Design a protein around this ligand. Structure first.
Ligand SMILES: O=C(O)CCC(=O)C(=O)O
Ligand SMILES: O=C(O)CCC(=O)C(=O)O
Ligand SMILES: [Fe+2]
Ligand SMILES: [Fe+2]
Lengths: 281, 280
């Protein structure tokens, strides 16, 4: 593989890449750059790549160990890959800013989304840079946040009252809650590789900053959750059938619009595991 | 005779008995009165039927007094302002504020005397800037210490409320010119005790200049609420002839406007203060 065409969709986050057939493995000249592409633009987009779960699970394992979701349905015979089929009976639930599975000791470092069945229009998906948003913070503020820890809870994005349709569904929730208690993650996170600083909190799971008072936390989080929706921090993608999206889950957050029902939307996703989030001067 | 100092709480306010403010106080009495004001930030003395003069004489022992260019004053004592509120001059102090912080040298304190009062209502409350600051977590203390905030005249006196007649629209424009926005420490070090205290008030503070606009809005939103917490306050129910002495350097106060159509008359002495500063 000679090289790849990387087109930045913005100065901070965004990149549309081509010249990379994702149905068949790739060399080591290609991976490096594609790897460093996602590690550079935080989230890259590759089009026209009609690949099946196994193919998706394949590449995802090239980045690292994959993670299995405790409540979301998986594709047939393919646990590793979770399926997001949405309709009137199964409303969308990712229309909130979040960072995939930060409720575990070592949150996923990346993920690969793939469009299967898309509605006529809608279902756009956004990503926001945790590193930009940090840079946008005044010095006095970085000093404040850096060093503080914030709790993450599975229940915040998955409440019991939302998993009682059946007794099975309820049982699965109870188990998932059990294996995932609330735990701490730095407000400011140092990227394992780059070493760049980034805001590591997200509305989907962060319940509170334990290092300050309850109301100081409400006020700080109330600011951070708004701060990250600033346009200049994000890239927006309009989906098209058979499309690939790979992003770094250590320094970003995404949001998936809910505006296509009663139509049906089907997405497949691979979830690469990562290390222990941390902070360092 | 030592004065009786009864604290009204663990952080702020106290009621003092044993002092006859109608006559000069001995060194021993003024000193324990002075020190009680620094300690409790706001003290109250009841049954003190004094004259403006006698009030001025007491205020002059705390520092220079202000002669107000507008507000009317007592019989023949320019230093004693008359705050006469009723239906044709409604109360306008029912908001948390620190007096005239929009000038380089906000008053160091004041002496308020209740001349005439509504049958009920008119309660005035003070909130402790010291207790509020110390109730912050170490990370907020280090954040707010050293930051500066803008204090604007126009935040308490908005242009949209002075547009009726084009007359009181230019005298507004004029006021706004004689009092431009200026800065103060977000955390003020008391000139005497060296105690640190939050020094913003929503009557005049418009924003922290040392951080972003949004960050400022979030911080102030928090601080304007944090200081209204019950634990940091003392509430006073007035009685005719009450005297209240407070340290405007580290507190804020709020006067309830819930007694019209009844009439309320207070006499006030304003004590000029020095420059507000922060020193670690
Ligand atoms: O449906 C999408 O486009 C994204 C869904 C999502 O938030 C995820 O897979 O983590
Ligand atoms: O009327 C009062 O009791 C207090 C009014 C006031 O805010 C002041 O004198 O500064
Ligand atoms: Fe997601
Ligand atoms: Fe006042």
């Amino acid at each position: 593989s000679e090289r790849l065409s990387i087109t930045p969709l913005g100065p901070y986050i965004g990149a549309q890449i081509s010249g990379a057939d994702l149905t068949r493995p790739l060399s080591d000249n290609q991976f490096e750059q594609l790897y460093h592409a996602v590690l550079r633009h935080q989230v890259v987009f590759l089009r026209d790549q009609a690949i099946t779960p196994q193919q998706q699970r394949a590449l995802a394992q090239r980045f690292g160990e994959l993670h299995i979701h405790p409540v979301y349905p998986h594709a047939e015979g393919v646990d590793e890959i979770i399926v997001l089929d949405t309709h009137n009976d199964n409303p969308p639930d990712n229309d909130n800013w979040h960072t995939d599975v930060t409720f575990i000791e070592t949150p996923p470092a990346g993920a690969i989304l793939a469009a299967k069945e898309l509605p006529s229009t809608g279902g756009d998906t956004l990503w926001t840079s945790g590193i930009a948003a940090y840079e946008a913070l005044s010095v006095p503020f970085r000093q404040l946040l850096s060093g503080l820890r914030a709790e993450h809870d599975f229940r915040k994005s998955f409440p019991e009252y939302k998993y009682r349709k059946t007794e099975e569904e309820h049982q699965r929730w109870r188990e998932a809650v059990a294996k995932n208690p609330p735990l701490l993650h730095p407000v400011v996170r140092t990227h394992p590789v780059s070493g760049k600083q980034a805001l590591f909190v997200n509305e989907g799971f962060t319940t509170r900053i334990v290092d300050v008072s309850e109301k100081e936390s409400e006020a700080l989080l109330s600011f951070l959750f708004a701060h990250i929706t600033k346009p200049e921090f994000q890239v927006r993608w309009r989906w098209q059938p058979n499309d690939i999206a790979i992003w770094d889950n250590r320094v970003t957050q995404h949001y998936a619009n809910a505006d296509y029902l009663p139509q049906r939307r089907i997405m497949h996703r691979a979830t690469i595991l990562g290390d222990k989030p941390f902070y360092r001067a």
